[PDB]
From a paper:
In [name], cryptic transcription at the coding region is prevented by the activity of [name] histone deacetylase (HDAC) complex [name], which is carried by the transcribing RNA polymerase II (RNAPII) to deacetylate and stabilize chromatin. The five-subunit [name] complex contains a unique subunit [name], three core subunits ([name], [name], and Ume1) that are shared between the 12-subunit Rpd3L complex, and an [name] subunit that is also a component of the NuA4 histone acetyltransferase (HAT). The overall structure of [name] reveals that the [name], Rco1A, and Eaf3A subunits form a large continuous scaffold to hold the [name] deacetylase in position. [name] utilizes the conserved [name] basic surface to bind to the nucleosomal DNA positions at SHL + 2, SHL + 5, and SHL + 7, under the conditions involving different H3K36me3–CHD interactions and DNA linker interactions.
One is identical to the SHL + 2 state and another novel state that we termed the linker tightening state. In the linker tightening state, [name] rotates around the nucleosomal DNA axis by ~150° with the [name] conserved basic surface binding to the nucleosomal DNA at the SHL + 7 position. This rotation makes the [name] main body leaving the nucleosomal disc entirely, with MRGA-PHDA and MRGB-PHDB arms interacting with the entry and exit DNA linkers. The position of [name] in the linker tightening state, which is created without H3K36MLA, further reinforces the notion that the interaction between [name] CHDs and H3K36MLA is the key factor in maintaining [name] on the nucleosomal disc and hence the ability of [name] to sample and target histone tails within proximity. Collectively, our results indicate that following deacetylation and absence of constraints from H3K36me3, [name] disengages from the nucleosomal disc while maintaining its interactions with the DNA linkers, which are in turn tightened. The [name]-mediated tightening of the DNA linker could potentially serve as a mechanism that counteracts the binding of transcription factors to nucleosomes at cryptic start sites for repressing cryptic transcription.
Author numbering:
A (entry chain S), H (entry chain O): 38 to 133
B (entry chain Q), F (entry chain U): 11 to 117
C (entry chain R): 29 to 119
D (entry chain T): 24 to 100
E (entry chain V): 29 to 120
G (entry chain P): 22 to 100
The structure:
């Protein structure tokens, strides 16, 4: 069978997910997570669909920027993989 | 008597001076509001909107389409230096990111 | 209550810039949010400038200083040029 | 259980949008945790905004104000 | 006009907390700047909360929401309890 | 009539409720300010000042000086976690930083 | 007077790094931190001089400087 | 010629400059640099002493925080010596 080298499929995924702005995170798990988080602060709390969309967009953009900083730190450390220490360093510099 | 010349048409400016003045007055940001302050704010807003829309239309032209959609706006914001610096802490929905690949990532 | 919208204003600005380029409803909302955010930022900076020297009024100079503080570089210079041209056309 | 509701391929796609070639196996839990912290902060701000208005449903509008008061303003809503 | 300053109020708070220990004028300026900055932050949050709800007044609920928002963690509920205690003492 | 009572005794606090109401009215945040809003503001400011001064006095006790120094205030601010996230983007003059050294740097 | 970027001496940079907990300080970082200190200074100074020119003011006061620092989200206490 | 180790005096200076709050950049060169930078904006501009003081405090605090971030980047990259790439990474993470 045909075999692809490690990286070209990754680069193709990078390209195809950077040209388009589709919703990477599925609607239902993010909505369920939002309801679970909000249920500890206020019981019987509702969320309109556009509110869930907006929160999902903000979360996805924030996580994309955090992953960009994580990859940046990984390249600074001469590393291709991204480690949780990279995320910790990026958040510490960003003060999060 | 004479016909109404309005406010925005007197200055030759498309953005509403009257709406900006009403928002500034109802926003209680100052006890008094000058006459030229809404004119200046509307002019600055129109310039910024025109620059953003021009860059977004250019990006759509590179996208082989003639309708501006928010990915084009995000590309226009992030591509130009001054608007990216102005909107650095600003997130655009349905926009994605710049299609850039690091040097070490490419084979 | 009713909610204001800048659909016609951004529409006519776009047709003045590109006469043959459309815009989507989501992009209309993005533009509205952008213009309102810039309006709030400039108005807050101008109000802070007025309160800074015990001034109870906001004039064109307050918006000028707010634009120079917020907008960077050549964007700020072109904004001041456009605002000055608008005020001179008014008078 | 909804914290694990988000999927590992979703996190992979999120990193792909961030221009990351490869992802380590133990960073998924850390990304989930920091996402939980960020969502907790934003949801707390939105809950305070909703409770201030004597409202029982979190609209989209106070969510974008909650994000904007954190230096993460959202456009399109 | 008269320049605002919380010098004696900060000093009285220090004496009711640490009566033996004093405070310096550089530290006094730092405390005055902190009090002023927190006051402006909370007042701006209350004003924006009133504007977003189409409200033309700032009440105790505005301050409660502002200190729930800007102040994080245990400080939020502690300031909420202090404000509620002050409100009840005012009403009594 | 009866003797006038100051707001400090009425609200059981030390920060000036009258001054806070004065800067709220003259600071044009809203066209109206409620009665309990300056009281709540004075209470919150008084509690924050009390907590910061208590932590500064504790830091001075660990240093044995009887006078609060801007270094003591900086140590008090950056030692408490909630004060650290509240005052994270805030500069304190003549305060320095915490003396933290990484384990790999120490021999 | 020009060429005052050399006023921030290398030992002053070393002291600033020691306050930051830096053990080993490269010889090539001094130019870079002079550049970033210069850039931060032009940003804060341009905000301060816009504040000064707004109020018909000719001498830059400490108040405007700390107000500029706060509007860049870097508020300074003690002035 | 008793000589200390290259890295013990470094830690001693770190402790000394972290415990003390005395300023590190001399006032006259910083004032001259501030005047040089401001002379390109406003001709014949005057700086009061407290303005230069506050500017110096803010500048040293920003440089110190950036130095902690670059040091953390150095340890994250399994390194001790800071390099200008660490400063560039720290600046780009915060978007400066």
């Amino acid at each position: 069978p045909h075999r692809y080298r490690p990286g070209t499929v990754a680069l193709r995924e990078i390209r195809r997910y950077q040209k388009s702005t589709e919703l990477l995170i599925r609607k239902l798990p993010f909505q369920r997570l939002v309801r679970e988080i909000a249920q500890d602060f206020k019981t019987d709390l509702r969320f309109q669909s556009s509110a869930v969309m907006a929160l999902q967009e903000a979360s996805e953009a924030y996580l994309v920027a955090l992953f960009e900083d994580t990859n940046l730190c990984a390249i600074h450390a001469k590393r291709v993989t991204i480690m949780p220490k990279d995320i910790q360093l990026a958040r510490r510099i960003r003060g999060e | 008597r004479a016909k109404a010349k309005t406010r925005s048409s007197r200055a030759g400016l498309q953005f509403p001076v009257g709406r900006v003045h009403r928002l500034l007055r109802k926003g209680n940001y100052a006890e008094r509001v000058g006459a030229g302050a809404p004119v200046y704010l509307a002019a600055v807003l129109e310039y910024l909107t025109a620059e953003i829309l021009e860059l977004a239309g250019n990006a759509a032209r590179d996208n082989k389409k003639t309708r501006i959609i928010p990915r084009h706006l995000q590309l226009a914001v992030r591509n130009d230096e001054e608007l990216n610096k102005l909107l650095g802490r600003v997130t655009i929905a349905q926009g994605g990111v710049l299609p850039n690949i690091q040097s070490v990532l490419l084979p | 209550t009713r909610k204001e919208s800048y659909a016609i204003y951004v529409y006519k600005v776009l047709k003045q810039v590109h006469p043959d380029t459309g815009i989507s409803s989501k992009a209309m909302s993005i533009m509205n949010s952008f213009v309102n955010d810039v309006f709030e930022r400039i108005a807050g900076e101008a109000s802070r400038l007025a309160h800074y020297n015990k001034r109870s009024t906001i004039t064109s100079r307050e918006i000028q200083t707010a634009v120079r503080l917020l907008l960077p570089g050549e964007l700020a210079k072109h904004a001041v040029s456009e605002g000055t041209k608008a005020v001179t056309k008014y008078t | 259980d909804n914290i694990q509701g988000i999927t590992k391929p979703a996190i992979r796609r999120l990193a792909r949008r961030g221009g990351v070639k490869r992802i380590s196996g133990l960073i998924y839990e850390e990304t989930r945790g920091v996402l939980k912290v960020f969502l907790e902060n934003v949801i707390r701000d939105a809950v305070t905004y909703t409770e201030h208005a004597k409202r029982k449903t979190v609209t989209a509008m106070d969510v974008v104000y909650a994000l904007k008061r954190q230096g993460r303003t959202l456009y399109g809503f």
